[PDB]
Amino acid sequence: YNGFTGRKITSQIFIGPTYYQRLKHMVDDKIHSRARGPIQILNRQPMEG
Amino acid sequence: KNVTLGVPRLKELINISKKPKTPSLTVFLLGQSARDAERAKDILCRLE
Amino acid sequence: LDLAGPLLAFLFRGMFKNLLKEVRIYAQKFIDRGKDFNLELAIKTRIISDGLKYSLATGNWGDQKKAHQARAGVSQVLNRLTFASTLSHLRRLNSPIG
Amino acid sequence: FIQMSVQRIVEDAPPIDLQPPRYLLKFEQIYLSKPTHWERDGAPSPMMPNEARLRNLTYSAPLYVDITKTVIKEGEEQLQTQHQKT
Amino acid sequence: MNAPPAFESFLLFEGEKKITINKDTKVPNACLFTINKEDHTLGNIIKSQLLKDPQVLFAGYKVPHPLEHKIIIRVQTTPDYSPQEAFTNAITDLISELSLLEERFRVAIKDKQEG
Amino acid sequence: FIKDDYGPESRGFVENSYLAGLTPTEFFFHAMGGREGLIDTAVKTAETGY
Amino acid sequence: PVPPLSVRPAVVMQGSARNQDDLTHKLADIVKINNQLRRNEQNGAAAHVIAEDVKLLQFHVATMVDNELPGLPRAMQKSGRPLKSLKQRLKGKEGRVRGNL
DNA sequence: AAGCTCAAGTACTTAAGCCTGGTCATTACTAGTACTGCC
RNA sequence: CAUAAAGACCAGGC
DNA sequence: GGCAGTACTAGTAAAGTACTTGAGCTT
């Protein structure tokens, strides 16, 4: 049954338990934002990493 | 017969390499040698 | 396949030969007087200890002054993410080809 | 590696020839003991690997080799002193 | 770190009106309602109730995006009948139904126990 | 397999389908068939970018 | 030429001591053997020793420019790490041209 | 004898793009100076 | 508002 | 009291290309 309107979903969806693994990769550690921060010593360019 | 294709052949073309991996020469026949396989066989013997 | 035994043997021979080498250097240099000779001052344990500990620590495999010629990639840090990842990292092969 | 190869590397090494008196050095046999730490005071203690991790120690064993030493003084008597647990 | 607190869903902070009303110039006699801090719970009700009224030509709702809590309901009625009146009448009818459903459900409860 | 077997099974023709599932030898031959794809994917990118 | 401190900045560790770039030490060598060659020109020495010092001076002066020369031993500052020559600075990927420009 | 080109021999070169973590060691030898012990 | 060096290798991601 | 020895602390060592080069053959 549809969640929002409660109407039946015409096609019959395939349901079953399957074993799922969370992965080490998570967006909180992959997010980065840069405005005029620290600067490299030799190149006078923004830092790496 | 096989021909190098894709990225390696593109390397042979862009590099203008001296010796390609698969050099090939196609040959066409003017006269009755074209339609008849006999004289064609004769040219086949004369080109090899 | 090179496991701990053959690898640590290949590593132990040359280091042991440096131990004997400095036993020869300090030995003879202390002998030229003809006074006497003392063993316990002729053996530097920093050779074996610091050498094994070093080449296990960094992973560069060989003499550290020869590290350019020395093969690298042996003895990575073990992966603790999952017990499966650890069992996998403990059972592995590494081809020397570049 | 321990139970075989190390004795082969210690044994298969050539005896030390030196020199007029002569000085020869030979390695009899090699002995390991359970991993032990020698502290700042020099007090040995058995290390469990947990305290080895927590303190950044290195989990390792002391290595001892008997060393027989022969001196040749030309007086027909070559005196050999054998040292245990070098 | 960017996760919104558990309520962006219903609680209104300073300045946000619950309902805002904008007339629609594409069609005569059509209006557009914007319901802040609601979701399909209410909108499906109201839409299904507005489709009974024979004077309502168009009734629809949408959430422009789920991560925002908002509802947009377009209503088009027949001439000389304001769509706001259709929406009010819809709500009043809905209450008139739900109260009756409560009472009959209570009668059913008291009957199922020693009845 | 027996030496000098050129038959369809020995040389890697896969009779089964993913629904029914592979036999073991067809599974290993299948892994060999995929390894070439992975290797091509990894190797081509550098030459193409260069 | 000796490039400015901006081209070869020092390395400030904790404020206790200042390390130095590959250049600074290389130029240090060049100044050492240059001074030795000056002195041995004033004395005159045995005159083949001059040739030796001009060959080693050749090694340092020509090495600072190119450390990757084949057939020659590649200068080793310390820690078994070869020097970074100006060519190595300006050449490969992450070199100034391709990397910083 | 000079010179000409043509063959092998030799040296030398570059090898994807961006990004994330960690570990590690910055050297080990030789010489000089200072301190302690013994005569 | 300044300091945490640089480099090296290894693991991984698309 | 002075001299010698030892220890510690501070300087200090895959393929593919072009290029070149040596030999081989001719006016």
Which CATH number covers residue E40?
3.30.1360.10
Domain count, chain E: 1
Give residue numbers, 7 to 46 of A, with CB < 7 Å from strand I: 25, 37-38, 40-42
Residues 6+ apart with CB under 8 A from E25: none
- Residue C17 assigned to a binding site: yes
Task: Count CA atoms closer than 13 A to G41's CA, side-chain side.
Answer: 8
Distance between CA atoms of residues E34 and A16, nearest Å: 39
- Residue whose structure tokens are 């495999």: C61
For residue E100, give Cα distances in angstroms to C93, E43, E94, F10, F39: 75, 21, 10, 77, 71
The reply to whether G78 Cβ lies less than 7 angstroms from strand I is no
- Residue whose structure tokens are 């082969």: D8
F47 touches chain B (CB under 8 A): yes
- Helices in A1-49 by DSSP H: which ranges? 27-30
Distance between CA atoms of residues C30 and G42, nearest Å: 41
Distance between CA atoms of residues F6 and D51, nearest Å: 62
Query: Which of left, alpha, beta for B6 (phi over 0: left; psi -120 to 50: alpha)?
Result: left
Task: Give the residue from chain G lying closest to C67, CA to CA.
Answer: G80
Cβ atoms of E86 and E55 closer than 8 Å? yes
Q: How was this structure determined?
A: cryo-EM
Cβ atoms of E32 and E73 closer than 8 Å? yes
Distance between CA atoms of residues B18 and B10, nearest Å: 14
- Nearest one of D72, D70, D27 to C20, comparing CA atoms: D27
Instruction: Write out the DSSP string of D16-72.
Output: EEE---EEEEEEEEEEE-S-EEE-TT--EEEPPHHHHHHTT------EEEEEEEEEE
How many angstroms separate the CA of D24 from the C1' of J2? 39
Distance between CA atoms of residues G67 and G89, nearest Å: 11
- Residue whose structure tokens are 């020099």: D42
How many angstroms separate the CA of A31 from the C1' of H21? 14
Resolution (angstroms) equals 3.4
What are the beta bridge partners of residue D79? D71
Q: How far A28 CA lies from chain E's nearest CA (Å)?
A: 7
Q: How far A44 CA lies from chain E's nearest CA (Å)?
A: 31
Distance between CA atoms of residues G83 and G68, nearest Å: 10
Q: Which nucleotide is nearest to C41 (CA to C1')?
A: J6
- Residue whose structure tokens are 């250097």: C25
- Helices in chain C by DSSP H: which ranges? 4-31, 45-58, 83-90
Task: Count CA atoms closer than 13 A to G44's CA, side-chain side.
Answer: 0
Range of the domain at E32: 1-115
B7 touches chain F (CB under 8 A): yes
Q: How far is CA D40 from the centre of its chain?
A: 22
Residues 6+ apart with CB under 8 A from C34: D21
Cβ atoms of C93 and C73 closer than 8 Å? no
What are the beta bridge partners of residue D37? D45
- Nearest one of C95, C88, C89, C35 to C71, comparing CA atoms: C95
How many angstroms separate the CA of D55 from the C1' of H34? 36
For residue F23, give Cα distances in angstroms to F17, F29, F37: 10, 10, 21
